[PDB]
């Protein structure tokens, strides 16, 4: 899934919108809108880090 | 590749009411911003309004602030016009622009802001006037 | 507010004749500046986005130049299909102001 969002930069008062592909298997809707808005699994339980 | 058309443009009884439509297709229309420009006779080219990709910020000219209103549905790659309180001035053919670079980088507020655009994509405008 | 202003009005040419167009700004625009040209009766076409950067799929004939508040345009070696109006538009800017449109044709 080609998923695009916003995120932060070093620079606090700034902000950016960048794009990156996931598996489906790490992506789950939020159900509210179909289509789009979805969130990475595992979100609502606990923040991944980064390996 | 980028085809762009707009519709919904035609006569109309000065100081009323009207409403211009445009859509696209061959790209990712949730990523580029759109612009509504005009071309009356003689006098040249004029930029009229100005909308982001998301369909959140707006901007106008002068000319046009107030009177006009710009929308688009990412969901039916759709853009919009909303007129009201049209005057005679304001006849003239107007074109459906895109920008040339997509929203994505850094910004400020809204995503493509903090980025310099230019109407590089620019469809079969439509024959806007008012008379009795 | 910013306002632009081109030159010449009108000229005529011929195939191979070599002409130039030139616009100026009220302000400084460093270089986001722009150039079209349009057929009559058909919509405008990019040809140049920077102050001198070329667009994809024009001939490589075209060129521009300038910065800060002077730009020009050269045609070099104009064919029977670089007969149409060029307009010289400024960018960075709010109202993103139009040239006032020049007609080449034949003479």
């Known amino acids: 899934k080609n998923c695009s969002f916003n995120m932060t930069t070093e620079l606090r008062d700034k902000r950016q919108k960048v794009y990156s592909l996931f598996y489906r298997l790490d992506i789950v809707p939020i159900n509210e809108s179909q289509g789009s808005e979805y969130r990475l699994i595992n979100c609502n339980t606990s923040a991944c880090t980064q390996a | 590749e980028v085809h762009l058309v707009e519709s919904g443009g035609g006569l109309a009884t000065p100081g009323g009411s009207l409403r211009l439509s445009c859509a696209a297709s061959?790209?990712?229309?949730?990523?580029?911003?759109m612009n509504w420009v005009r071309q009356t006779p003689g006098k040249g080219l004029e930029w009229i309004a100005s909308?982001?990709?998301?369909?959140?910020?707006?901007d106008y000219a002068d000319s046009v602030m107030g009177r006009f209103t710009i929308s688009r549905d990412n969901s039916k790659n759709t853009l919009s016009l909303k007129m009201n309180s049209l005057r005679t001035e304001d006849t003239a053919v107007y074109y459906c622009?895109?920008?040339?670079?997509?929203?994505?980088?850094?910004?400020?507020?809204?995503?493509?802001?903090?980025?310099?655009?230019?109407?590089?994509?620019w469809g079969q405008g439509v024959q806007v006037t008012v008379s009795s | 507010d910013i306002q632009m202003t081109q030159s010449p009005s009108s000229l005529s040419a011929s195939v191979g004749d070599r002409v130039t167009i030139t616009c100026q700004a009220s302000?400084?625009?460093?270089?986001?500046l722009a150039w079209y040209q349009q057929k009559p009766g058909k919509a405008p076409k990019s040809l140049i986005y920077?102050?001198?950067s070329l667009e994809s799929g024009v001939p490589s004939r075209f060129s521009g130049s300038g910065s800060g508040t002077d730009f020009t345009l050269t045609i070099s070696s104009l064919q029977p299909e670089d007969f149409a109006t060029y307009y010289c538009?400024?960018?960075?800017?709010?109202?993103?102001?139009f040239g006032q449109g020049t007609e080449v044709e034949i003479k």
């Open positions: 622009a895109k920008v040339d670079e997509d929203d994505y980088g850094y910004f400020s507020i809204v995503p493509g802001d903090l980025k310099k655009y230019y109407f590089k994509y």
């Open positions: 061959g790209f990712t229309f949730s990523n580029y911003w």
């Open positions: 909308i982001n990709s998301a369909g959140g910020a707006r």
């Open positions: 302000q400084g625009i460093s270089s986001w």
């Open positions: 920077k102050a001198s």
């Open positions: 538009q400024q960018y960075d800017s709010a109202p993103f102001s």
